[PDB]
Amino acid sequence: QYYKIDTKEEILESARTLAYDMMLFYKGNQSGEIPGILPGPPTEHKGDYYWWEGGAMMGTYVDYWHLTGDPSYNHVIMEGMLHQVGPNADYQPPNHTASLGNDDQGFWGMSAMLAAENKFPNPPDDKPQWLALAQAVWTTQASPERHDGTCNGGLRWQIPPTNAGYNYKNTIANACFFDLGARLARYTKNNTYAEWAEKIFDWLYAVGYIDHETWAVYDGGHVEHNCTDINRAQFSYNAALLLHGAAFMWNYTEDQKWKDRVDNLLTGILRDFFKDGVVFEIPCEGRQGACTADMLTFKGYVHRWMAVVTQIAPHTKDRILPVLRTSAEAAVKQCVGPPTGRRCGFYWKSGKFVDPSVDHTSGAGEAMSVLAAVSSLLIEYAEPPATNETGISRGDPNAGMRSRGAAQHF
Ligand SMILES: OC[C@H]1O[C@H](OC[C@H]2O[C@@H](O)[C@@H](O)[C@@H](O)[C@@H]2O)[C@@H](O)[C@@H](O)[C@@H]1O
Ligand SMILES: [Ca+2]
Ligand SMILES: [Ca+2]
């Protein structure tokens, strides 16, 4: 194996090298390129990756700096995050309408939220601030036209009604909105965020995307079947995001119901996604060549989000941290690929490097996921997410409410 992770010093060094290798995929800080995105989209034959994955990358680097103290990439990341905000400072840039799903917008919002929680340096005074960007995403997601009576509520996957998939009310869209609301409640101490988060979680439970018996977390259902045609694929990031938001709700509310939800979601995740201590993407990983570019990034979110759960729901620490350690050990074991001797693949549990070309990408998601897993080994040494008591970001009471905002011509 190339990377060492047995001590704090070794983990820092490994994370710094992993941060370098992941950055090689990113061209957006170079002359003539677009900040904030990885190469793509594949629909234009520009590269393998969609817009939302750029937002995921930004958040991974906000976390990297928080966990390691290394600010080397902070300028590049601030530039990327700011470039993609759109004219209404809401992460709805219209050039990206095809990529405008509530989830895609949500991931950008979550990265802004993370920047506020982590005290990431503020943008210039005349630019949108991190908390305000998170508030704008949440506000647009709470807008009445996104909450119709079909399936008794819930967000649709897509924002534009003409986007393919507008008829799919899926877990990830709702989980993003839930997680933002829970996080905004904790940061701002404003209970209206929390009331929305409660409502959306209760909807996910009622519609049966959360299994009442096992606490498995399914993918979604379609409005023309009243959401009853549940797609029971279990993607790791769905359960993990609900766990993350539930942990923020437990920390904010101190309500035993939320502690029980954390515990039940966590039991399910350990049962379903961790295979002898290693995270495993159950709908696709069992054979090579099935995971999409998006799926290759999920395990990295699992690691980062579960690590934060241990800070804000500290009773979970002993269930989570040993398992994240075994999973990260497997991640680095297989980061041995040519031509560098340290290239990372996806198939951690297998114990073997598999070239990312088997899944038809250059390998940025796998690189991101290992970076996430290794960095998050430092969670014990990191500060917990800040609230407005110690944060440095600023909000906006009219975030998401501009008169030129897209909701005004829906
Ligand atoms: O990969 C599982 C995932 O697949 C579909 O959404 C894929 C992917 O689309 C991107 O554009 C972005 O929206 C991202 O969040 C999403 O993962 C969909 O069927 C979804 O429900 C499912 O979880
Ligand atoms: Ca999308
Ligand atoms: Ca490709």
| Tokens coding 362 | 């250059």
Specify the long-range contacts of residues 329-338, CB closer than 8 Å, at least 24 apart. Answer: 329/5, 330/277, 330/278, 331/369, 331/370, 331/373, 331/374, 332/1, 332/2, 332/3, 332/5, 332/14, 332/370, 332/374, 333/1, 335/1, 335/2, 335/3, 335/18, 335/370, 336/1, 336/2
Residue 363 Cβ contacting ligand 1 at under 6 Å: no
Cis omega (within 30 of 0) on the bond before 41? yes
Is residue 21 marked as binding? no
Query: Does 215 fall in a domain?
Result: yes
Q: Which helix (H) or strand (E) holds 188?
A: helix 171-188
Query: Does 336 fall in a domain?
Result: yes
Query: Does 2 fall in a domain?
Result: no
For residues 213 and 207, what is the distance between their CA atoms, to the nearest angstrom? 14
Query: Does 3 fall in a domain?
Result: no
Residue nearest to atom 9 of ligand 1 (CA): 294
What is the experimental resolution, given in Å to one decimal place?
A: 1.3
For residues 375 and 73, what is the distance between their CA atoms, to the nearest angstrom? 14
Closest CA to 57 of 28, 73, 78, 36: 36
Distances in Å between the Cα of 172 and the Cα atoms of 3, 186, 243 are 33, 21, 12
For residues 211 and 243, what is the distance between their CA atoms, to the nearest angstrom? 14
Ligand 2 centroid to residue 100 C-alpha, Å: 6
Full residue range of the structural domain in which residue 286 is found? 8-408
For residues 371 and 204, what is the distance between their CA atoms, to the nearest angstrom? 31
**Close Cβ partners of 1 (under 8 Å, ≥ 6 residues apart):** 332, 333, 335, 336
**Least distant ligand from the CA of 100:** 2
Q: Which atom of ligand 1 lies nearest, measured to the CA of 238? A: 23
The total of structural domains in the chain comes to: 1
Residue 219 Cβ contacting ligand 1 at under 6 Å: yes
For residues 307 and 312, what is the distance between their CA atoms, to the nearest angstrom? 9
Query: Which amino acid is located at 354 in the chain?
Result: V
Closest CA to 196 of 240, 150, 144, 256: 144
Is residue 44 classed as helix, strand or coil in its secondary structure? helix
Q: Which helix (H) or strand (E) holds 168?
A: strand 168-170
Q: What share of the chain is helix, strand, coil (3-state, %, to 5)?
A: 55, 5, 40
Residue 101 Cβ contacting ligand 1 at under 6 Å: yes
Are 372 and 304 spatial neighbours (Cβ–Cβ below 8 Å)? yes
Closest CA to 56 of 385, 292, 368: 368
Residue 52 Cβ contacting ligand 1 at under 6 Å: yes
Ligand 1 centroid to residue 280 C-alpha, Å: 17
Among 294, 297, 301, 302, name the best residue to mutate to test ligand 1's pocket (greatest count of ligand atoms within 8 A of Cβ): 294
Q: Which helix (H) or strand (E) holds 220?
A: strand 220-222
**Least distant ligand from the CA of 96:** 2
Ligand 1 centroid to residue 294 C-alpha, Å: 7
For residues 378 and 382, what is the distance between their CA atoms, to the nearest angstrom? 7
Residue nearest to atom 1 of ligand 1 (CA): 295
- Cβ neighbourhood burial of 289 (10 Å; 0-12, 13-18, 19+): exposed
| Tokens coding 408 | 């005004």
- Three-state SS sequence of 332-385: HHCCCECCCCCECCCCCCCCCCCCHHHHCCCCHHHHHHHHHHHHHHHHHHCCCC
Residue 220 Cβ contacting ligand 1 at under 6 Å: yes
Is residue 75 marked as binding? no
Q: What are phi and psi of 181, to 5 degrees?
A: -60, -45
Is residue 66 marked as binding? no
Task: Identify the CATH number of the domain in which residue 316 sits.
Answer: 1.50.10.20
Cis omega (within 30 of 0) on the bond before 339? yes
For residues 299 and 344, what is the distance between their CA atoms, to the nearest angstrom? 13
Query: Does 272 fall in a domain?
Result: yes
Query: Does 260 fall in a domain?
Result: yes
Ligand 3 centroid to residue 387 C-alpha, Å: 40
Are 110 and 184 spatial neighbours (Cβ–Cβ below 8 Å)? no
Ligand 1 centroid to residue 165 C-alpha, Å: 10
Residue 51 Cβ contacting ligand 1 at under 6 Å: no
Are 105 and 141 spatial neighbours (Cβ–Cβ below 8 Å)? yes
Query: Does 1 fall in a domain?
Result: no
**Least distant ligand from the CA of 53:** 1
DSSP letter assigned to residue 119: T
Query: Which amino acid is located at 27 in the chain?
Result: K
Q: What are phi and psi of 400, to 5 degrees?
A: 80, 0
Query: Does 117 fall in a domain?
Result: yes
Residue 239, beta-bridge partner list: none
For residues 349 and 346, what is the distance between their CA atoms, to the nearest angstrom? 9
* Experimental determination technique: X-ray
Indicate the angle between helix axes 236-253 and 191-207, nearest 10 degrees: 140
For residues 173 and 160, what is the distance between their CA atoms, to the nearest angstrom? 14
For residues 29 and 410, what is the distance between their CA atoms, to the nearest angstrom? 34
Ligand 2 centroid to residue 356 C-alpha, Å: 22
Are 357 and 339 spatial neighbours (Cβ–Cβ below 8 Å)? no
DSSP letter assigned to residue 391: -
Residue 148 Cβ contacting ligand 1 at under 6 Å: no
Q: What are phi and psi of 275, to 5 degrees?
A: -110, 105
What is the gyration radius of the CA atoms in the chain, in angstroms? 20
